[PDB]
Design a protein around this ligand. Sequence first.
Ligand SMILES: CC(C)CCC[C@@H](C)[C@H]1CC[C@H]2[C@@H]3CC=C4C[C@@H](OC(=O)CCC(=O)O)CC[C@]4(C)[C@H]3CC[C@]12C
Ligand SMILES: CC(C)CCC[C@@H](C)[C@H]1CC[C@H]2[C@@H]3CC=C4C[C@@H](OC(=O)CCC(=O)O)CC[C@]4(C)[C@H]3CC[C@]12C
Ligand SMILES: CC(C)CCC[C@@H](C)[C@H]1CC[C@H]2[C@@H]3CC=C4C[C@@H](OC(=O)CCC(=O)O)CC[C@]4(C)[C@H]3CC[C@]12C
Ligand SMILES: CC(C)CCC[C@@H](C)[C@H]1CC[C@H]2[C@@H]3CC=C4C[C@@H](OC(=O)CCC(=O)O)CC[C@]4(C)[C@H]3CC[C@]12C
Ligand SMILES: CC(C)CCC[C@@H](C)[C@H]1CC[C@H]2[C@@H]3CC=C4C[C@@H](O)CC[C@]4(C)[C@H]3CC[C@]12C
Ligand SMILES: CC(C)CCC[C@@H](C)[C@H]1CC[C@H]2[C@@H]3CC=C4C[C@@H](O)CC[C@]4(C)[C@H]3CC[C@]12C
Ligand SMILES: CC(C)CCC[C@@H](C)[C@H]1CC[C@H]2[C@@H]3CC=C4C[C@@H](O)CC[C@]4(C)[C@H]3CC[C@]12C
Length: 1149
Amino acid sequence: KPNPLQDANLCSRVFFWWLNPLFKIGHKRRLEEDDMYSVLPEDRSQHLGEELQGFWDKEVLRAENDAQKPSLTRAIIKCYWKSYLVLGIFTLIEESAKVIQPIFLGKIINYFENYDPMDSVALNTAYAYATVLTFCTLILAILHHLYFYHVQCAGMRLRVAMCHMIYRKALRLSNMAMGKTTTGQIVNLLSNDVNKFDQVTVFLHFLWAGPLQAIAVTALLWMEIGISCLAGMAVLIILLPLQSCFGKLFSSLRSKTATFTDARIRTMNEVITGIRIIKMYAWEKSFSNLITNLRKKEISKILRSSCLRGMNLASFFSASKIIVFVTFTTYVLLGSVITASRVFVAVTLYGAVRLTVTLFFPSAIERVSEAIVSIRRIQTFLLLDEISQRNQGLSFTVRPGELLAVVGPVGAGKSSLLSAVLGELAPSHGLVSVHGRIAYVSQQPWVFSGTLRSNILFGKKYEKERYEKVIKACALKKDLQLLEDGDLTVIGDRGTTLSGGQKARVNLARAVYQDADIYLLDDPLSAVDAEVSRHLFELCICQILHEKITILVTHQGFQAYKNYFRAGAHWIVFIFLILLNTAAQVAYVLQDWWLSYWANKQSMLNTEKLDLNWYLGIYSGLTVATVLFGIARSLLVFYVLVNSSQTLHNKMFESILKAPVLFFDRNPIGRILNRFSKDIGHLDDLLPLTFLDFIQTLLQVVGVVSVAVAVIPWIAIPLVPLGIIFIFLRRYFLETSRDVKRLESTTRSPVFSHLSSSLQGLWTIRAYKAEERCQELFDAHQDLHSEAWFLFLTTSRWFAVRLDAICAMFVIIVAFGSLILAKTLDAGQVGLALSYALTLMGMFQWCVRQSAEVENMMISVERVIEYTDLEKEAPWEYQKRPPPAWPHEGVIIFDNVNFMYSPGGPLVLKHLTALIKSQEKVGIVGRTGAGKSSLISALFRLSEPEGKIWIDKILTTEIGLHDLRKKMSIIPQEPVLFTGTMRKNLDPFNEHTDEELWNALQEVQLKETIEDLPGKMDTELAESGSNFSVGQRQLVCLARAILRKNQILIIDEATANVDPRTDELIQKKIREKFAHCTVLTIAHRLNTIIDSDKIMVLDSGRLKEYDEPYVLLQNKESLFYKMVQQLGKAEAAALTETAKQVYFKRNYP
Ligand SMILES: CC(C)CCC[C@@H](C)[C@H]1CC[C@H]2[C@@H]3CC=C4C[C@@H](OC(=O)CCC(=O)O)CC[C@]4(C)[C@H]3CC[C@]12C
Ligand SMILES: CC(C)CCC[C@@H](C)[C@H]1CC[C@H]2[C@@H]3CC=C4C[C@@H](OC(=O)CCC(=O)O)CC[C@]4(C)[C@H]3CC[C@]12C
Ligand SMILES: CC(C)CCC[C@@H](C)[C@H]1CC[C@H]2[C@@H]3CC=C4C[C@@H](OC(=O)CCC(=O)O)CC[C@]4(C)[C@H]3CC[C@]12C
Ligand SMILES: CC(C)CCC[C@@H](C)[C@H]1CC[C@H]2[C@@H]3CC=C4C[C@@H](OC(=O)CCC(=O)O)CC[C@]4(C)[C@H]3CC[C@]12C
Ligand SMILES: CC(C)CCC[C@@H](C)[C@H]1CC[C@H]2[C@@H]3CC=C4C[C@@H](O)CC[C@]4(C)[C@H]3CC[C@]12C
Ligand SMILES: CC(C)CCC[C@@H](C)[C@H]1CC[C@H]2[C@@H]3CC=C4C[C@@H](O)CC[C@]4(C)[C@H]3CC[C@]12C
Ligand SMILES: CC(C)CCC[C@@H](C)[C@H]1CC[C@H]2[C@@H]3CC=C4C[C@@H](O)CC[C@]4(C)[C@H]3CC[C@]12C
């Protein structure tokens, strides 16, 4: 993949003319990894890493010789100073041009001030000054992009070399070092701490170009207006601590909102995870109340932070107005007069120095601080003790052809012995002599990123016959056939596409194919079956390894915007907001126009004087109006958008609380929580800020264009082509930038994956001498990502060059049409128009970038609105409320009941017809998934069933959901305890008394177990009772059932893996607590339901038998007797005897 940048001229490199085919291809179709350009030889990972490693080694040697600490910063400087000096030269030139061009602007205005229609030498000099101004504009607009690309490439090179050296160090760390650190510390310092180097170089040269530019601008201002510049300079200086305090207060406000956002997200996770149980118990109202309280508490602080951010933006908007106001107020109060040549030179110089002071210097300070911190961290990492290069009283030897075996309990030291053999255990005393290639198998299987064939090869050359022999010996044919691509299938991190046995088999195959002199195996057959383990142990060891040293360890659009804005406030508020923004921009421009009018009226004079009171009063009024309107616009925009976010969140949460269980079955929990964690997070604190910034910048651009058009009406003619070209160019760019932005995102993850895999299997990597091959693989992975970072930089520069070309064409048109039509213009108009044209720079590009960011961020709004209108089940309440004691008896009649999880899916129940008399015990038996689990769903109307179900001669489908689910108790398979007090977990609605709760706890025998915590019952618990036992949770649910005290009770899978003592306790309490309540039990074991009055028999969703268990046991052809006989003989006899005893005791007293 040749890189056309290698064969480009200087003219083709300044304008990025070599990137056109890529944009054409991206416009035609989509871009893949085959469409990228290979990196230049000077940008390869190995080259940069080796250079920086040599410099760092020299620095470390010098520091050790001089007996002091080494400096990674000093090494980096000594490496990159030569290449970073020339960028300093060009930034010096750029800042010089920025400072210089106001002088020629003022000279053009001065020509306009002494207009003589007959003189031509003055006109020629004015044309020359305009030409020099255009040259400065072209220097600032054209070459800056190549300069910026080189500046960013320097930081990219620094980051790549950093990553290479970090990986090289991490590949040889000692065991004590690995014990001190973790596998996450190495990953994070390369995933987030090395990215500071991409941004440190952009602002690195402003630390000396900020103060110098400020001093030069102050000197020029003193030359122009005099001592009056000190007021503007004082305001500009004061602007820095104000911003520092704003930041220090916003951070404090945000750290207080985070503590509520986290609690809200945790509660959301809990309710989403336990949605079936919450719907079963009808507690959605309580959870809604809790979430509403938390959301309101978070929203208050979000409102405070939004107000602070709006004030910050208003201050940024009106700072220039305030500076110019104070400067010229003192200028005219000291006794001088106002002229257009000086006013609009001071304005331009103040604008330049204001951008420099308020943005570039603080950004440089912050990024340099972060970079220094990161360099300190990396220097700390690069100095841990490393393994020395190979130059109780264990003493044994092993010869080739000997299958040594070690058998012992866990913790004996077999793994430690193998590590000592490999050299991992440092010999405190004794001597270990190991010579030759060593093959090692770790206890835990390890598979690195790549394919199965690549994993087996481990970098070795592929051989067909050897690979086939190894595969056949390892019995991997079935595992290969299990995959789609066979042996070429890509295995993900931790083998997500395979199993543990498959990973172990692949590792064994790789070890065998490596063909080492010494073979070491650790726990090979523990995680696999019997036949495969025997086949391995025989035909891959006793024959293959019979000639090798062996040691073995064995154990055997537009609607989106419309809805987003309509959710915020009524359309009248939108009209008022539009008017407010328009008035703010109008006043902002009218202040400058008033300065121009003052200059013109002073010039057209005569001694007569000007009304200072009048002019200064109108000036101050315009400034005050500008400031107030900016503040109002910012506050109103923030309030409206935050209210929109709040309303959207409320509607979405209310809709998802009522969505049926099918929606939660179809969607994963993480996907559900993403729209409450990330999308709402955007809508709450980033979209309003981005929207307000974009609106501000767009209105400023419109104001500049409007001033230019108003001064010279003919400028509206080239504007139509300049806008059409801009629209088409933006479409053309965005058709490829969005494809490039994802390549650099999906190519970054393999680096971290390889890092994690190499860290995990570091012992296996070092067992063989194949570590340079892993270094080369890491180099290739890093090259594949620097291959897309290159395009990310170059396409952005490509777009910026053409945007700057359009802006510079506009500036040139203004500056030359002013002189062409000089017979009708005057100094004030010319100065105003030309100064605004000069300010258009940077503003245009920032507006475009902010528009792109807003369009990117609207996806969260689209997702939130999509979840806002989900499906809704039957309402919780109906018009006809039931009698207060509708559970009179509990007789339940099923008549022609067909139930399916989803419409159009396979059926589960087929024509169920049965009757359940009050106060009887019913057992349910059958196959797993054969309709046993759908009975509770049909009875609780989780999915609306087909047919008629009668409870006390009332139809279930005729009464509301909350008026039905609340009157029948449920005991789930796995009980869940919700976060909160025991009082909350036993009675969320507070419908009972403390004495009743204590009585229930005594009945379930947790009262004594509870009354020893620091709190009586209000102790906070962990997620789903992590500090409690399964039996404890079951008894808590039993206490819930007793407290509810409903006539109908249903148990589903009571005991699965609980201790027999708690099982017997639960069974006896269930039997002796609910004598007068109808109980339906769905049990997977026949011991618990042997004494039931009747047993339901289900066969593939068909009701087969409905009679007494003894009667069914009498018939041998009955399904119940067959399932009994499957259990055994003695247990079957005991169950039959128990059924006979129950039948005799009940029916025949
Ligand atoms: C980005 C910057 C560093 C490059 C732009 C050039 C500048 C270094 C400036 C500084 C002083 C300027 C000069 C100052 C005064 C004049 C006199 C002026 O008037 C004439 O000599 C008459 C011209 C004519 O008759 O056409 C022409 C422009 C010129 C040479 C200027 C040309 C541009 C100069 C060299
Ligand atoms: C007219 C020109 C030549 C003046 C140049 C400006 C320097 C006198 C100052 C301005 C900003 C300063 C930097 C601001 C921030 C930092 C980070 C800071 O790093 C630390 O050692 C502190 C740890 C941390 O940053 O958390 C101190 C040095 C340094 C590079 C400073 C070095 C001296 C600098 C370049
Ligand atoms: C885009 C729209 C909806 C914004 C609001 C309307 C503006 C386009 C109007 C409202 C008031 C207008 C101003 C009202 C009066 C004048 C005086 C006028 O002064 C002169 O040049 C003549 C001298 C004189 O007025 O005696 C210049 C235009 C200006 C500033 C107008 C500029 C255009 C303004 C700001
Ligand atoms: C002459 C200039 C100042 C324009 C006049 C416009 C004002 C009449 C409007 C425009 C912006 C409005 C403000 C926009 C945003 C806010 C924040 C908003 O939220 C809060 O302060 C919290 C309210 C709560 O928590 O209930 C309350 C209304 C308020 C002050 C508005 C009050 C009325 C304002 C100042
Ligand atoms: C006196 C009138 C005629 C104008 C004379 C031009 C003078 C003032 C110009 C010419 C060269 C200019 C300097 C060129 C280079 C730089 C370095 C830059 O980082 C800050 C601005 C600064 C320091 C400029 C300040 C202004 C400057 C000294
Ligand atoms: C506050 C913004 C939104 C709009 C109001 C702008 C006001 C403050 C400005 C803009 C245009 C100005 C007017 C422009 C021209 C003249 C003609 C002169 O013989 C008397 C003053 C008068 C009439 C000015 C008074 C102040 C003025 C009305
Ligand atoms: C951003 C949008 C919504 C509103 C911005 C409108 C502003 C920037 C425009 C609209 C009308 C314009 C004015 C129209 C007419 C003149 C007279 C001319 O001799 C000097 C400029 C001046 C005074 C213009 C200054 C800029 C102006 C006030």
